[PDB]
JSON list of C-alpha atoms in Angstrom, two decimals:
[
{"chain": "K", "resi": 1, "resn": "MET", "atom": "CA", "xyz": [-32.31, 33.61, 5.91]},
{"chain": "K", "resi": 2, "resn": "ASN", "atom": "CA", "xyz": [-32.64, 30.00, 7.02]},
{"chain": "K", "resi": 3, "resn": "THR", "atom": "CA", "xyz": [-31.67, 28.00, 3.96]},
{"chain": "K", "resi": 4, "resn": "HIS", "atom": "CA", "xyz": [-29.96, 24.62, 3.77]},
{"chain": "K", "resi": 5, "resn": "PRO", "atom": "CA", "xyz": [-26.94, 23.94, 1.52]},
{"chain": "K", "resi": 6, "resn": "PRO", "atom": "CA", "xyz": [-26.25, 20.28, 0.55]},
{"chain": "K", "resi": 7, "resn": "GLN", "atom": "CA", "xyz": [-22.90, 18.93, 1.72]},
{"chain": "K", "resi": 8, "resn": "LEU", "atom": "CA", "xyz": [-22.83, 15.90, -0.57]},
{"chain": "K", "resi": 9, "resn": "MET", "atom": "CA", "xyz": [-20.70, 17.06, -3.50]},
{"chain": "K", "resi": 10, "resn": "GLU", "atom": "CA", "xyz": [-17.65, 15.92, -5.45]},
{"chain": "K", "resi": 11, "resn": "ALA", "atom": "CA", "xyz": [-13.91, 16.28, -4.78]},
{"chain": "K", "resi": 12, "resn": "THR", "atom": "CA", "xyz": [-13.09, 13.25, -2.68]},
{"chain": "K", "resi": 13, "resn": "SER", "atom": "CA", "xyz": [-9.80, 11.87, -1.35]},
{"chain": "K", "resi": 14, "resn": "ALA", "atom": "CA", "xyz": [-8.60, 8.34, -0.69]},
{"chain": "K", "resi": 15, "resn": "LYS", "atom": "CA", "xyz": [-5.80, 7.90, 1.82]},
{"chain": "K", "resi": 16, "resn": "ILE", "atom": "CA", "xyz": [-3.71, 4.77, 1.36]},
{"chain": "K", "resi": 17, "resn": "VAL", "atom": "CA", "xyz": [-0.72, 4.19, 3.61]},
{"chain": "K", "resi": 18, "resn": "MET", "atom": "CA", "xyz": [1.94, 1.76, 2.45]},
{"chain": "K", "resi": 19, "resn": "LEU", "atom": "CA", "xyz": [4.49, 0.08, 4.70]},
{"chain": "K", "resi": 20, "resn": "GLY", "atom": "CA", "xyz": [6.68, -2.99, 4.44]},
{"chain": "K", "resi": 21, "resn": "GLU", "atom": "CA", "xyz": [10.36, -3.65, 5.02]},
{"chain": "K", "resi": 22, "resn": "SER", "atom": "CA", "xyz": [13.49, -1.62, 4.31]},
{"chain": "K", "resi": 23, "resn": "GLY", "atom": "CA", "xyz": [15.33, -2.68, 1.17]},
{"chain": "K", "resi": 24, "resn": "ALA", "atom": "CA", "xyz": [12.32, -4.65, -0.05]},
{"chain": "K", "resi": 25, "resn": "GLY", "atom": "CA", "xyz": [11.63, -2.04, -2.71]},
{"chain": "K", "resi": 26, "resn": "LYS", "atom": "CA", "xyz": [9.29, -0.23, -0.32]},
{"chain": "K", "resi": 27, "resn": "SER", "atom": "CA", "xyz": [9.87, 3.34, -1.52]},
{"chain": "K", "resi": 28, "resn": "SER", "atom": "CA", "xyz": [10.73, 1.99, -4.98]},
{"chain": "K", "resi": 29, "resn": "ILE", "atom": "CA", "xyz": [7.22, 0.71, -5.70]},
{"chain": "K", "resi": 30, "resn": "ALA", "atom": "CA", "xyz": [5.66, 3.91, -4.35]},
{"chain": "K", "resi": 31, "resn": "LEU", "atom": "CA", "xyz": [7.62, 5.92, -6.91]},
{"chain": "K", "resi": 32, "resn": "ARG", "atom": "CA", "xyz": [6.10, 3.76, -9.64]},
{"chain": "K", "resi": 33, "resn": "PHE", "atom": "CA", "xyz": [2.59, 4.94, -8.80]},
{"chain": "K", "resi": 34, "resn": "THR", "atom": "CA", "xyz": [3.37, 8.52, -7.76]},
{"chain": "K", "resi": 35, "resn": "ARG", "atom": "CA", "xyz": [5.19, 9.70, -10.87]},
{"chain": "K", "resi": 36, "resn": "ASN", "atom": "CA", "xyz": [5.25, 6.24, -12.50]},
{"chain": "K", "resi": 37, "resn": "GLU", "atom": "CA", "xyz": [9.03, 6.48, -12.74]},
{"chain": "K", "resi": 38, "resn": "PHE", "atom": "CA", "xyz": [11.70, 4.28, -11.22]},
{"chain": "K", "resi": 39, "resn": "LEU", "atom": "CA", "xyz": [14.88, 5.26, -9.41]},
{"chain": "K", "resi": 40, "resn": "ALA", "atom": "CA", "xyz": [17.46, 2.47, -9.55]},
{"chain": "K", "resi": 41, "resn": "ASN", "atom": "CA", "xyz": [19.48, 4.02, -6.73]},
{"chain": "K", "resi": 42, "resn": "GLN", "atom": "CA", "xyz": [16.30, 4.84, -4.80]},
{"chain": "K", "resi": 43, "resn": "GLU", "atom": "CA", "xyz": [16.99, 4.22, -1.14]},
{"chain": "K", "resi": 44, "resn": "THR", "atom": "CA", "xyz": [14.22, 3.31, 1.27]},
{"chain": "K", "resi": 45, "resn": "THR", "atom": "CA", "xyz": [13.10, 6.59, 2.83]},
{"chain": "K", "resi": 46, "resn": "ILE", "atom": "CA", "xyz": [13.82, 7.08, 6.53]},
{"chain": "K", "resi": 47, "resn": "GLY", "atom": "CA", "xyz": [11.48, 10.03, 6.91]},
{"chain": "K", "resi": 48, "resn": "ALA", "atom": "CA", "xyz": [8.27, 10.01, 4.90]},
{"chain": "K", "resi": 49, "resn": "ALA", "atom": "CA", "xyz": [7.51, 10.11, 1.19]},
{"chain": "K", "resi": 50, "resn": "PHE", "atom": "CA", "xyz": [4.07, 11.62, 0.78]},
{"chain": "K", "resi": 51, "resn": "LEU", "atom": "CA", "xyz": [2.65, 12.65, -2.57]},
{"chain": "K", "resi": 52, "resn": "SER", "atom": "CA", "xyz": [-0.98, 13.51, -3.22]},
{"chain": "K", "resi": 53, "resn": "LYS", "atom": "CA", "xyz": [-2.35, 13.77, -6.75]},
{"chain": "K", "resi": 54, "resn": "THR", "atom": "CA", "xyz": [-5.80, 14.09, -8.26]},
{"chain": "K", "resi": 55, "resn": "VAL", "atom": "CA", "xyz": [-7.22, 11.54, -10.68]},
{"chain": "K", "resi": 56, "resn": "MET", "atom": "CA", "xyz": [-10.47, 11.57, -12.62]},
{"chain": "K", "resi": 57, "resn": "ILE", "atom": "CA", "xyz": [-12.50, 8.37, -12.47]},
{"chain": "K", "resi": 58, "resn": "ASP", "atom": "CA", "xyz": [-15.78, 8.34, -14.40]},
{"chain": "K", "resi": 59, "resn": "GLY", "atom": "CA", "xyz": [-15.87, 12.13, -14.24]},
{"chain": "K", "resi": 60, "resn": "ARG", "atom": "CA", "xyz": [-15.19, 12.07, -10.50]},
{"chain": "K", "resi": 61, "resn": "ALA", "atom": "CA", "xyz": [-12.16, 14.06, -9.41]},
{"chain": "K", "resi": 62, "resn": "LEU", "atom": "CA", "xyz": [-10.56, 12.55, -6.33]},
{"chain": "K", "resi": 63, "resn": "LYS", "atom": "CA", "xyz": [-7.04, 12.84, -4.97]},
{"chain": "K", "resi": 64, "resn": "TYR", "atom": "CA", "xyz": [-5.11, 9.85, -3.70]},
{"chain": "K", "resi": 65, "resn": "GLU", "atom": "CA", "xyz": [-3.01, 10.29, -0.61]},
{"chain": "K", "resi": 66, "resn": "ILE", "atom": "CA", "xyz": [-0.29, 7.66, -0.69]},
{"chain": "K", "resi": 67, "resn": "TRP", "atom": "CA", "xyz": [2.00, 7.66, 2.30]},
{"chain": "K", "resi": 68, "resn": "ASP", "atom": "CA", "xyz": [5.35, 5.95, 1.86]},
{"chain": "K", "resi": 69, "resn": "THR", "atom": "CA", "xyz": [6.49, 5.48, 5.44]},
{"chain": "K", "resi": 70, "resn": "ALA", "atom": "CA", "xyz": [9.97, 4.61, 6.65]},
{"chain": "K", "resi": 71, "resn": "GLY", "atom": "CA", "xyz": [10.92, 1.17, 5.34]},
{"chain": "K", "resi": 72, "resn": "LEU", "atom": "CA", "xyz": [11.28, -0.28, 8.81]},
{"chain": "K", "resi": 73, "resn": "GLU", "atom": "CA", "xyz": [10.92, 2.12, 11.72]},
{"chain": "K", "resi": 74, "resn": "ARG", "atom": "CA", "xyz": [8.46, 1.39, 14.49]},
{"chain": "K", "resi": 75, "resn": "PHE", "atom": "CA", "xyz": [9.81, 3.92, 17.00]},
{"chain": "K", "resi": 76, "resn": "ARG", "atom": "CA", "xyz": [8.96, 6.96, 14.89]},
{"chain": "K", "resi": 77, "resn": "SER", "atom": "CA", "xyz": [5.95, 9.22, 15.39]},
{"chain": "K", "resi": 78, "resn": "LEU", "atom": "CA", "xyz": [4.50, 7.76, 12.18]},
{"chain": "K", "resi": 79, "resn": "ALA", "atom": "CA", "xyz": [3.81, 4.46, 13.95]},
{"chain": "K", "resi": 80, "resn": "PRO", "atom": "CA", "xyz": [0.52, 5.56, 15.65]},
{"chain": "K", "resi": 81, "resn": "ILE", "atom": "CA", "xyz": [-0.48, 8.44, 13.37]},
{"chain": "K", "resi": 82, "resn": "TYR", "atom": "CA", "xyz": [-0.04, 6.89, 9.90]},
{"chain": "K", "resi": 83, "resn": "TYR", "atom": "CA", "xyz": [-3.58, 5.48, 9.99]},
{"chain": "K", "resi": 84, "resn": "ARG", "atom": "CA", "xyz": [-5.18, 8.81, 11.03]},
{"chain": "K", "resi": 85, "resn": "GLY", "atom": "CA", "xyz": [-7.95, 8.08, 8.55]},
{"chain": "K", "resi": 86, "resn": "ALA", "atom": "CA", "xyz": [-6.48, 5.53, 6.18]},
{"chain": "K", "resi": 87, "resn": "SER", "atom": "CA", "xyz": [-9.04, 4.22, 3.72]},
{"chain": "K", "resi": 88, "resn": "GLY", "atom": "CA", "xyz": [-6.69, 1.45, 2.72]},
{"chain": "K", "resi": 89, "resn": "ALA", "atom": "CA", "xyz": [-3.28, 0.04, 3.54]},
{"chain": "K", "resi": 90, "resn": "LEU", "atom": "CA", "xyz": [-0.53, -1.51, 1.46]},
{"chain": "K", "resi": 91, "resn": "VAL", "atom": "CA", "xyz": [2.49, -3.58, 2.49]},
{"chain": "K", "resi": 92, "resn": "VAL", "atom": "CA", "xyz": [5.33, -4.79, 0.28]},
{"chain": "K", "resi": 93, "resn": "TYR", "atom": "CA", "xyz": [7.10, -8.12, 0.81]},
{"chain": "K", "resi": 94, "resn": "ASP", "atom": "CA", "xyz": [9.76, -9.87, -1.28]},
{"chain": "K", "resi": 95, "resn": "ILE", "atom": "CA", "xyz": [9.06, -13.49, -2.25]},
{"chain": "K", "resi": 96, "resn": "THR", "atom": "CA", "xyz": [12.63, -14.71, -1.71]},
{"chain": "K", "resi": 97, "resn": "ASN", "atom": "CA", "xyz": [13.17, -12.67, 1.44]},
{"chain": "K", "resi": 98, "resn": "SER", "atom": "CA", "xyz": [11.16, -14.37, 4.18]},
{"chain": "K", "resi": 99, "resn": "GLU", "atom": "CA", "xyz": [11.82, -11.43, 6.51]},
{"chain": "K", "resi": 100, "resn": "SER", "atom": "CA", "xyz": [9.59, -9.12, 4.49]},
{"chain": "K", "resi": 101, "resn": "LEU", "atom": "CA", "xyz": [6.65, -11.51, 4.91]},
{"chain": "K", "resi": 102, "resn": "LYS", "atom": "CA", "xyz": [7.45, -11.80, 8.62]},
{"chain": "K", "resi": 103, "resn": "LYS", "atom": "CA", "xyz": [7.52, -8.02, 8.92]},
{"chain": "K", "resi": 104, "resn": "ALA", "atom": "CA", "xyz": [4.36, -7.73, 6.81]},
{"chain": "K", "resi": 105, "resn": "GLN", "atom": "CA", "xyz": [2.41, -10.02, 9.15]},
{"chain": "K", "resi": 106, "resn": "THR", "atom": "CA", "xyz": [3.69, -7.91, 12.04]},
{"chain": "K", "resi": 107, "resn": "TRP", "atom": "CA", "xyz": [2.24, -4.70, 10.60]},
{"chain": "K", "resi": 108, "resn": "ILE", "atom": "CA", "xyz": [-1.09, -6.23, 9.56]},
{"chain": "K", "resi": 109, "resn": "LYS", "atom": "CA", "xyz": [-1.63, -7.59, 13.08]},
{"chain": "K", "resi": 110, "resn": "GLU", "atom": "CA", "xyz": [-1.15, -4.25, 14.84]},
{"chain": "K", "resi": 111, "resn": "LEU", "atom": "CA", "xyz": [-2.83, -1.98, 12.29]},
{"chain": "K", "resi": 112, "resn": "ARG", "atom": "CA", "xyz": [-6.05, -4.02, 12.18]},
{"chain": "K", "resi": 113, "resn": "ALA", "atom": "CA", "xyz": [-6.20, -4.13, 15.96]},
{"chain": "K", "resi": 114, "resn": "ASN", "atom": "CA", "xyz": [-5.61, -0.38, 16.19]},
{"chain": "K", "resi": 115, "resn": "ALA", "atom": "CA", "xyz": [-7.60, 0.93, 13.23]},
{"chain": "K", "resi": 116, "resn": "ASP", "atom": "CA", "xyz": [-10.52, -0.59, 11.35]},
{"chain": "K", "resi": 117, "resn": "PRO", "atom": "CA", "xyz": [-11.63, -4.19, 10.54]},
{"chain": "K", "resi": 118, "resn": "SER", "atom": "CA", "xyz": [-12.92, -3.32, 7.06]},
{"chain": "K", "resi": 119, "resn": "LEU", "atom": "CA", "xyz": [-9.75, -1.45, 6.14]},
{"chain": "K", "resi": 120, "resn": "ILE", "atom": "CA", "xyz": [-8.62, -3.06, 2.90]},
{"chain": "K", "resi": 121, "resn": "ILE", "atom": "CA", "xyz": [-4.99, -4.15, 2.94]},
{"chain": "K", "resi": 122, "resn": "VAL", "atom": "CA", "xyz": [-3.00, -4.74, -0.22]},
{"chain": "K", "resi": 123, "resn": "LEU", "atom": "CA", "xyz": [-0.47, -7.55, 0.06]},
{"chain": "K", "resi": 124, "resn": "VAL", "atom": "CA", "xyz": [1.97, -7.03, -2.77]},
{"chain": "K", "resi": 125, "resn": "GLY", "atom": "CA", "xyz": [4.97, -9.18, -3.61]},
{"chain": "K", "resi": 126, "resn": "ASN", "atom": "CA", "xyz": [8.27, -7.89, -4.93]},
{"chain": "K", "resi": 127, "resn": "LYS", "atom": "CA", "xyz": [10.27, -9.06, -7.95]},
{"chain": "K", "resi": 128, "resn": "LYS", "atom": "CA", "xyz": [8.18, -11.58, -9.91]},
{"chain": "K", "resi": 129, "resn": "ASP", "atom": "CA", "xyz": [11.51, -12.55, -11.47]},
{"chain": "K", "resi": 130, "resn": "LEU", "atom": "CA", "xyz": [12.15, -14.69, -8.39]},
{"chain": "K", "resi": 131, "resn": "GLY", "atom": "CA", "xyz": [9.86, -17.37, -9.82]},
{"chain": "K", "resi": 132, "resn": "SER", "atom": "CA", "xyz": [12.47, -20.11, -9.48]},
{"chain": "K", "resi": 133, "resn": "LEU", "atom": "CA", "xyz": [14.36, -18.92, -6.40]},
{"chain": "K", "resi": 134, "resn": "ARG", "atom": "CA", "xyz": [11.36, -17.81, -4.35]},
{"chain": "K", "resi": 135, "resn": "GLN", "atom": "CA", "xyz": [11.94, -19.08, -0.83]},
{"chain": "K", "resi": 136, "resn": "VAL", "atom": "CA", "xyz": [8.36, -18.53, 0.27]},
{"chain": "K", "resi": 137, "resn": "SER", "atom": "CA", "xyz": [5.40, -19.48, -1.90]},
{"chain": "K", "resi": 138, "resn": "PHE", "atom": "CA", "xyz": [3.33, -16.49, -3.05]},
{"chain": "K", "resi": 139, "resn": "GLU", "atom": "CA", "xyz": [0.42, -18.94, -3.08]},
{"chain": "K", "resi": 140, "resn": "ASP", "atom": "CA", "xyz": [0.88, -19.35, 0.67]},
{"chain": "K", "resi": 141, "resn": "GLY", "atom": "CA", "xyz": [1.24, -15.62, 1.22]},
{"chain": "K", "resi": 142, "resn": "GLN", "atom": "CA", "xyz": [-2.02, -14.82, -0.54]},
{"chain": "K", "resi": 143, "resn": "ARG", "atom": "CA", "xyz": [-3.72, -17.45, 1.62]},
{"chain": "K", "resi": 144, "resn": "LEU", "atom": "CA", "xyz": [-3.25, -15.48, 4.84]},
{"chain": "K", "resi": 145, "resn": "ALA", "atom": "CA", "xyz": [-4.56, -12.47, 2.94]},
{"chain": "K", "resi": 146, "resn": "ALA", "atom": "CA", "xyz": [-7.76, -14.17, 1.81]},
{"chain": "K", "resi": 147, "resn": "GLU", "atom": "CA", "xyz": [-8.08, -15.76, 5.24]},
{"chain": "K", "resi": 148, "resn": "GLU", "atom": "CA", "xyz": [-8.14, -12.34, 6.91]},
{"chain": "K", "resi": 149, "resn": "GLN", "atom": "CA", "xyz": [-10.44, -11.00, 4.18]},
{"chain": "K", "resi": 150, "resn": "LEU", "atom": "CA", "xyz": [-7.78, -9.01, 2.33]},
{"chain": "K", "resi": 151, "resn": "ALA", "atom": "CA", "xyz": [-9.31, -8.26, -1.07]},
{"chain": "K", "resi": 152, "resn": "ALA", "atom": "CA", "xyz": [-5.99, -7.23, -2.62]},
{"chain": "K", "resi": 153, "resn": "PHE", "atom": "CA", "xyz": [-3.00, -9.52, -3.13]},
{"chain": "K", "resi": 154, "resn": "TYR", "atom": "CA", "xyz": [-0.81, -9.15, -6.22]},
{"chain": "K", "resi": 155, "resn": "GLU", "atom": "CA", "xyz": [2.75, -9.47, -7.55]},
{"chain": "K", "resi": 156, "resn": "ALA", "atom": "CA", "xyz": [4.82, -6.39, -8.37]},
{"chain": "K", "resi": 157, "resn": "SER", "atom": "CA", "xyz": [8.19, -5.57, -9.92]},
{"chain": "K", "resi": 158, "resn": "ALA", "atom": "CA", "xyz": [9.78, -2.13, -10.24]},
{"chain": "K", "resi": 159, "resn": "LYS", "atom": "CA", "xyz": [10.88, -2.72, -13.83]},
{"chain": "K", "resi": 160, "resn": "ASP", "atom": "CA", "xyz": [7.57, -4.43, -14.62]},
{"chain": "K", "resi": 161, "resn": "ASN", "atom": "CA", "xyz": [5.45, -1.39, -13.64]},
{"chain": "K", "resi": 162, "resn": "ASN", "atom": "CA", "xyz": [4.26, -3.55, -10.70]},
{"chain": "K", "resi": 163, "resn": "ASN", "atom": "CA", "xyz": [0.77, -3.49, -12.24]},
{"chain": "K", "resi": 164, "resn": "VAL", "atom": "CA", "xyz": [0.20, -0.58, -9.84]},
{"chain": "K", "resi": 165, "resn": "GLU", "atom": "CA", "xyz": [-2.48, 0.82, -12.14]},
{"chain": "K", "resi": 166, "resn": "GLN", "atom": "CA", "xyz": [-4.42, -2.44, -12.00]},
{"chain": "K", "resi": 167, "resn": "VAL", "atom": "CA", "xyz": [-4.24, -2.85, -8.22]},
{"chain": "K", "resi": 168, "resn": "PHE", "atom": "CA", "xyz": [-5.56, 0.69, -7.70]},
{"chain": "K", "resi": 169, "resn": "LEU", "atom": "CA", "xyz": [-8.14, 0.37, -10.48]},
{"chain": "K", "resi": 170, "resn": "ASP", "atom": "CA", "xyz": [-9.36, -2.81, -8.81]},
{"chain": "K", "resi": 171, "resn": "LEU", "atom": "CA", "xyz": [-9.72, -1.04, -5.48]},
{"chain": "K", "resi": 172, "resn": "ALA", "atom": "CA", "xyz": [-11.30, 2.07, -7.01]},
{"chain": "K", "resi": 173, "resn": "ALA", "atom": "CA", "xyz": [-13.69, -0.18, -8.94]},
{"chain": "K", "resi": 174, "resn": "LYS", "atom": "CA", "xyz": [-15.15, -1.65, -5.74]},
{"chain": "K", "resi": 175, "resn": "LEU", "atom": "CA", "xyz": [-14.32, 0.60, -2.76]}
]
């Protein structure tokens, strides 16, 4: 009766948790990858927006767990538990709102010191339309990403699809 069944099979899941700052299109960008639709009057969630869907890459069926946490709440129970096995992390920051970048650097400091060093973090900017009135240089923002070995840093806009397909395809391509 002593046989041995192989455990290595298909049906995988990638858990990516995305934080940022409230009002910085945090929940807005998440909606653009979940159902790929935009809600103009979409408020930043105070609880948790969690949708998990299966995609088929090269015949491989894997479901992505994307956790849209509260826009800016550090006192919630989500603070410690959000990275309970996060394969990757994402954080949204607006290029004219310096606060979002200041909040972003806050999250990235704690999460890397609490979770995993090789955890890939996606630095994504908000509203590429701010090309002229951008207070902080995106070029400078991506520098701190590359400096800390962040493989993913891109610009996103809710009405521009955010290139959310590309940023995830990039990640899925390497992993």
